[PDB]
Design a protein around this nucleic acid. Structure first.
Lengths: 75, 64, 73, 141, 191, 137
RNA sequence: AACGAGACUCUGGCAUGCUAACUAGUUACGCGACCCCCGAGCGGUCGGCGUCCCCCAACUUCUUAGAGGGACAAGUGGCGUUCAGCCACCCGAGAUUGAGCAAUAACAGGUCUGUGAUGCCCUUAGAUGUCGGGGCUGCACGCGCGCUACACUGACUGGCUCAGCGUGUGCCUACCCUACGCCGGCAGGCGCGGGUAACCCGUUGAACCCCAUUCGUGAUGGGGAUCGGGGAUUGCAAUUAUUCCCCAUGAACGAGGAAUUCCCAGUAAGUGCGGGUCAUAAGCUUGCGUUGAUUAAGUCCCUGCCCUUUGUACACACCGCCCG
């Protein structure tokens, strides 16, 4: 199988999906965003750096190779 | 007919069998009750004082 | 000399040996022994140099123990 | 901070930008086109990069008695993929580094050193030390 | 560093090999806490000595597999340090405890050997030594993480965390756990 | 952000839009990676994106540069056809036109009956390589 | 008792001990200067990393090469004829660092193309002894050694950044290693100047690697085949590409059946470098450092060879010699 095809540009509604979902996950990396949506991987990335805004998500290590993000900073 | 799981501790390392020479003879103090003591065959590297987890707890082998 | 990890191990050894060499001539023996104790205990070789060093490659393989390849016939 | 005090990546990052603001460095009109090394796969993603190399070199010279382009080509030179053959060194371009060396001179950061090789100038030595401080000062983190 | 000799930043004390017998070729540090999963390490000369080696490092070594990855310890150390962090985020705890648990849970208790058996060679159920139990477990988990990671976007550190966590409480989600149960199931028949 | 195109055509080739421009362009015969990378840099594009993105504007701008590279600070050495011969060009052949010139060149030295030509005609090899053991299948 | 093994020799680690060193360095001055302000100070001034000064400074620690010592399984404890030995433990380099040296006797093993070693033979002016030119490099197919690969432990761009064994001209007859300035995108071109070298190239500022980015799991950016055009280098001559570069064209290959090699610690494996070949030409061989595991710690099952006992119609010796 595993054939992966990705939405590589923002679709509004997919912008909403992002901010109204990702606070759901404890773990988020490139892959998560890719599998749970159908994000490019390239446009995963840009969503990560953006998300870290003032964060939906919080950095615990962005080793060159890997970001590793946690859920936002709730109760 | 049956099930249980048995802890046994190595008393004395006997020597090596398997024609390949890869199974080590062992003598086991029966852990839950010392008044038992039996011979079992091993896959791994074993040394005195470490512990086996016996399924069969009768049997008691020899060559092979 | 050496390379990147090689260097790290050397500098750390030099520093601990240093400190102890210093307590041996200027401070008192019990202190230096105390230090050799803590290092030697937890350790990493800090005060003693690891021997291990290259073995020479021998014709018939490009490594030391590695032997080339054979097909028979 | 001596420049030696600041980490290489931040130092170079800060100085390279400072050079960018200054607006007067000078730049083989090319720089759009150039790879920077035959070994190289693609040119530089940051087409802006001319500044970064300059900073890198200035820092590189300040450290050492005197250096010249051949050394830089090799430093920049990475491993080149022979394809069928095993990979080997290939000292990186000589035009870019040279131009970098010539341009730096214009600012006076570096000057011809005795017995060949460019050396940092006291003017440059002062300049690098100054930015080095600014970088150290920025923050902890 | 001076108070207690933590891990990258994790405490050795208070981690307990929850499994008699295994106790002790899993080497935490009944005093041995260090700092980094890298050492000069001479384990090879003796048959036993390997047990001395910190389980963490032992796991890190198994990580660097496959011809290309051989000798890349720095890479493994980096992966291991990340994995512990991911594991910690996932359940608090000591990820090192999590690591130990996965190891305790994965070693096949029982196994099978290919006894000659005359013809239609049958296989003899034999119990498995604790050194083997440890050795085998670390493979299983590493092979598990490595196998999963390869065609997926996810990183070894992540796949390792997933293999380690599922195993720590044997979810059976894990490749390793399924493998161990398979090896053991085989041991029981044969007998 | 936004959307559109998937699937855009430049000069006679269909170019997947999802794909990154530099890479996306490299479908076109004669646009290799070093090419397309330098063409785009010349052509002012935010390098950071997808061929499907961008404007009709930028596209003509890529094409215009692509078929007059010399006239844009692209050096001749970067080019596929230096030194023409028939016109003593320089050139960078593109698109359907590369297949064309390839044909020409082969014909040229087949007319002239030069051994290389002959080799191409029988469908062997023309660089000095041994023909005893390989290229057999 | 001797021969092989061993002892023997060589190489390499433990020696703030030994004797020493401007064709090796270090300390530490005297150190000013360059001199920066980097922080402090308003500044003089203090602490600060390097380069340079070189000196009627000092040293041998790193470096060097000579002599010195250390390992004898030494002590101790289990085991064993309580022996020979085996195992654990301490000091500490721990009993086994790694090679070189090879008997008795053999082989129709290989070599006449290493030999002005060589027999006989063959040839020997219309040569089988030299120049012009080609083959050796001719491609439906099989094989062996290898190389490069199959990607996100990765491919990429900027950036951290350390080495080691070795090498050179001034040559048995034509010629060296090359730092540095300039031009060129590259490839390379061009001008210099040192060096019989521990002086110079070269604190071999290597490469993996480490890292801040990009890519995003698409044979895609993994891979670099084949081909086209073109730039240059070696040579008198490269066409049958010597080679290198630049672009373009952008293959199979997405893990390998039957089989099968090799391997126990700086070892396997990744990774660059130097030497030999050499005018030019490395996918080779031949070492070297760097990064550095998994894994037996044994045994005789298969295989191979030698240990007894035993059988043998074998002895050119099982790749051998028995019935119609």
């Amino acid at each position: 199988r595993d054939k992966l095809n990705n939405l590589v540009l923002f679709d509004k509604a997919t912008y909403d999906k992002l901010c109204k979902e990702v606070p759901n996950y404890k773990l988020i990396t490139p892959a998560v965003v890719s599998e749970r949506l159908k994000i490019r991987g390239s446009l995963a990335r840009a969503a990560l750096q953006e998300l870290l805004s003032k964060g939906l998500i919080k950095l615990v290590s962005k080793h060159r190779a890997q970001v590793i993000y946690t859920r936002n900073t709730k109760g | 007919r049956v099930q249980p799981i048995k802890l046994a501790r190595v008393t004395k390392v006997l020597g090596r069998t398997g024609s390949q020479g890869q199974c080590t003879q062992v003598r086991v103090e029966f852990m839950d009750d010392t008044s038992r003591s039996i011979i079992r065959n091993v896959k791994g590297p074993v040394r005195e004082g470490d512990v086996l987890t016996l399924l069969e707890s009768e049997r008691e082998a020899r060559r092979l | 000399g050496g390379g990147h990890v090689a260097q790290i191990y050397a500098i750390r050894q030099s520093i601990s040996k240093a400190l102890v060499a210093y307590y041996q001539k200027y401070v008192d023996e019990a202190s230096k022994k105390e230090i050799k104790d803590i290092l030697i205990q937890y350790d990493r070789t800090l005060l003693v140099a690891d021997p291990r060093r290259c073995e020479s490659k021998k014709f018939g393989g490009p490594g030391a123990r590695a032997r080339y390849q054979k097909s028979y016939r | 901070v001596t420049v030696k005090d600041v980490n290489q990546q931040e130092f170079v990052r800060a100085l390279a930008a400072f050079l960018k603001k200054s607006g007067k460095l000078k730049v083989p009109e090319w720089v759009d086109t150039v790879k920077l090394a035959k070994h190289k796969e693609l040119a530089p993603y940051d087409e802006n990069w001319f500044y970064t190399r300059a900073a890198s070199t200035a820092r590189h010279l300040y450290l050492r008695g005197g250096a010249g382009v051949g050394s830089m080509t090799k430093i920049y030179g990475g491993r080149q993929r022979n394809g069928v053959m095993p990979s080997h060194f290939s000292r990186g371009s000589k035009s870019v580094a040279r131009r970098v060396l010539q341009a730096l001179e214009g600012l006076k950061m570096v000057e011809k050193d005795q017995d060949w090789g460019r050396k940092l100038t006291p003017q440059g030595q002062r300049d690098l030390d100054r930015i080095a401080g600014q970088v150290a000062a920025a923050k902890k983190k | 560093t001076p108070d207690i000799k933590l891990f990258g930043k994790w405490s050795t004390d208070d981690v307990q090999i929850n499994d008699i017998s295994l106790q002790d070729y899993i080497a935490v540090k009944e005093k041995y806490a260090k700092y980094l999963p890298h050492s000069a390490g001479r384990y090879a000369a003796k048959r036993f000595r390997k047990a001395q080696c910190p389980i963490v490092e032992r796991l890190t070594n198994s990580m660097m597999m496959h011809g290309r990855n051989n000798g890349k310890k720095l890479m493994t150390v980096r992966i291991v340090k990340h994995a512990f962090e991911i594991i910690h985020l996932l359940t608090g705890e000591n990820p090192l405890q999590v690591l130990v648990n996965a190891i305790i849970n994965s070693g096949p208790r029982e196994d099978s050997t290919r006894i000659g058996r005359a013809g239609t060679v049958r296989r003899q159920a034999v119990d498995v030594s604790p050194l083997r139990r440890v050795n085998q477990a670390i493979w299983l988990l590493c092979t598990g993480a490595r196998e999963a990671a390869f065609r997926n976007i996810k990183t070894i550190a992540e796949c390792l965390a997933d293999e380690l966590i599922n195993a720590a409480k044997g979810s059976s989600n894990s490749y390793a756990i399924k493998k161990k149960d398979e090896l053991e199931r085989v041991a029981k028949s044969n007998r | 952000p936004e959307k559109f195109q998937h699937i855009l055509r430049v000069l006679n080739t269909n170019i997947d839009g999802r794909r990154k421009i530099a890479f996306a362009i490299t479908a076109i015969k004669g646009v290799g990676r070093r090419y397309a990378h330098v063409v785009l840099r010349k052509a002012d594009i935010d390098l950071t994106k997808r061929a499907g993105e961008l404007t009709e504007d930028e596209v003509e701008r890529v094409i215009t540069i692509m078929q007059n590279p010399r006239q844009y600070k692209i050096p001749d050495w970067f080019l596929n056809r230096q030194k023409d011969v028939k016109d003593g060009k320089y050139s960078q052949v593109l698109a359907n036109g590369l297949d064309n010139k390839l044909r020409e060149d082969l014909e040229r030295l087949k007319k002239i009956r030069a051994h290389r030509g002959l080799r191409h005609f029988w469908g062997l090899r023309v660089r000095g390589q041994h023909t005893k053991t390989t290229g057999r299948r």
